[PDB]
């Protein structure tokens, strides 16, 4: 079906990229392939493990023994006790819910924010050498063997090098 | 050590830029120098002062005198009173914690979000005139005295002007 | 002879902050008692003078 254009440029996921969360894919004169950015993947796993633990471990816990007995003649108290309980129920239920809700919100943005940072890092290297074409795919104006490629992903991309060649293909038919 | 590539493009801070939070640096034919974006710095200070005050002043405060005495024979009540207290402790502790936690989260993104907005504003002015090269540094394809420079930071940058010159250096050796 | 807004068996405290871990028993218009040990609220940037031995 149709979809707002405000929806993340990279439309689909990759059952293909099994090794990690974020990562790349290449089509060059040597074959296809996927690749997981381990260092970023570990990073995010470290952070999320922390949010999970925070949400869990930050919660205090006194030894409590809820529960009280009264008789047919201490009903006012019993109702005071009732509301202290219902009172706490309505509180925790509400915070337990909005907490997971809002934290689930932020966590799926983290991830979004995270790939968009990867795609940024790349479009910043491959200045003119490449065409940005959508769903976060760059096409090359120049051959790009498994050096060039393990290189763009190494953060170590040579721009002058392949620039000369690419200069001419931003011309031809 | 190593680090996920999802980590902010601008890696380090500047003990050098003392005047404010966000800001610039220049190397041109006249000397080095740092410069603080006061207007943005004041802006953020205004906002953060507000978050700080919100978190503090929004908190209600009835005159209360916690504390009750009972005798060897009103122990059920005393335990009701005990749990009302422990109950409130476990609540505030939890919210006091997740509040600062999640608010600390958002505040360091605000700041991140904020410089990235500065770097955006700039890469949008210096279209072709400059090379984007990482850690948020642009190099010029043309001389850029203290006019040109106080100008890119004034939001008032002349693109046609220096364009002609730069056109040729995106050519030479 | 001092004044306070919040008394505790251990001493008086201030009320210009939201939370407090001095004491559960309180008389006055008091900060909420918490079992936390620090509640630092970041205001500024991530201090990163060096990216050394990272």
């Amino acid at each position, epitope marked *: 079906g149709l979809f707002g254009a405000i929806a993340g440029f990279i439309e689909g996921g990759w059952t293909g990229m099994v*090794d*990690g*969360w974020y990562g790349y894919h290449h089509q060059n004169e040597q074959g296809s392939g996927y690749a997981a950015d*381990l*260092k970023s*993947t*570990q*990073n995010a*796993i*470290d952070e*999320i*493990t922390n949010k*999970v*633990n925070s949400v*869990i*471990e930050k919660m205090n816990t006194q030894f409590t023994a809820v529960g009280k007995e009264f008789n047919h003649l201490e009903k006012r108290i019993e109702n005071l006790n009732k509301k202290v309980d219902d009172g706490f129920l309505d509180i925790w239920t509400y915070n337990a819910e909005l907490l997971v809700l809002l934290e689930n919100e932020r966590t799926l943005d983290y991830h979004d924010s995270n790939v968009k940072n990867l795609y940024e890092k790349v479009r910043s290297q491959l200045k003119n050498n490449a065409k940005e074409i959508g769903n976060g795919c760059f096409e090359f104006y120049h051959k790009c063997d498994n050096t060039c490629m393990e290189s763009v992903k190494n953060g170590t991309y040579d721009y002058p090098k392949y620039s000369e060649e690419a200069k001419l293909n931003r011309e031809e038919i | *050590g*190593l*680090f996920g590539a999802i980590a902010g493009f601008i890696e380090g801070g500047w003990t050098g830029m003392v005047d404010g939070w966000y800001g610039y640096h220049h190397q041109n034919e006249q000397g080095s120098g740092y410069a603080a974006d006061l207007k943005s710095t004041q802006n953020a200070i205004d906002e953060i002062t507000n978050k700080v005050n919100s978190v503090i002043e929004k908190m209600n405060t009835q005159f209360t005198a916690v504390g009750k005495e009972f005798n060897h024979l009103e122990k059920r009540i005393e335990n009701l009173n005990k749990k009302v207290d422990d109950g409130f402790l476990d609540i505030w502790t939890y919210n006091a914690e997740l509040l600062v936690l999640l608010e600390n989260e958002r505040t360091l993104d605000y700041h991140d979000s904020n410089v990235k907005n500065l770097y955006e504003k700039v890469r949008s002015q210096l279209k072709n005139n400059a090379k984007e090269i990482g850690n948020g540094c642009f190099e010029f394809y043309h001389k850029c005295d203290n006019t040109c420079m106080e100008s890119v930071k004034n939001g008032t940058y002349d693109y046609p002007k220096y364009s002609e010159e730069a056109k040729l250096n995106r050519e030479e050796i | 002879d001092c004044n306070t807004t919040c008394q505790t068996p251990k001493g008086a405290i201030n009320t210009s902050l939201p939370f407090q871990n001095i004491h559960p028993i309180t008389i006055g218009k008091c900060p909420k008692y918490v079992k936390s040990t620090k509640l630092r609220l970041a205001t500024g940037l991530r201090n990163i003078p060096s990216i050394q*031995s*990272r």
Partner: antibody
Amino acid sequence: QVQLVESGGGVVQPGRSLRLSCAASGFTFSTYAMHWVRQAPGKGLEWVAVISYDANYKYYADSVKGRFTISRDNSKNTLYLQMNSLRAEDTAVYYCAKDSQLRSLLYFEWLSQGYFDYWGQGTLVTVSS
Amino acid sequence: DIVMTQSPDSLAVSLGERATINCKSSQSVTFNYKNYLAWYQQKPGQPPKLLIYWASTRESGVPDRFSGSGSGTDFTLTISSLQAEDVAVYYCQQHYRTPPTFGQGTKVEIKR
């Protein structure tokens, strides 16, 4: 405080099977990854397998992939190694060990483990015809 | 699989001398300022005890003579007030990747 006891060691004919147990005491078992480590008689230390706290992640040394099955029971606070079709190369003393990291998410085969904070007194397993 | 090699295999020290055990690693085991690397101390006939973790941090209750160093790819355990209740084999272990690997170990002979 912390206590880890291994059992079920002994001498087995090659090709056959063995099941090691390890009872834990002194900490919250159901929130830590757990490892099995071994040491050939006189040789170095070989990491062998890790099972995540919830138990939906099990990872093995190349050299036992296929034949060993790590498992747990938080109900009983014990950790198991079930070795199958044992070679003599498998003869070793087997140390039950604790990951330092609380609730580590082992979503991936390669991610990092904590360190090994507490060890078992170790039980030896001899494979031999 | 990252490979933890260490030098030397044995080492002799007269009850009181220094004791520096090197520990190189196939590749950098430092990520976000942390040094994913521990040392374990096995007394001949015993399970290994944790000694230093995160490259340089005495555990539990470990005597001050013990000192860990290094970053990236090369590390170093350092014994010092070389007492003799402390002759045993020393393992460096990386845990930055699974599988976590070990060193082959260093044996510790009281040189006379």
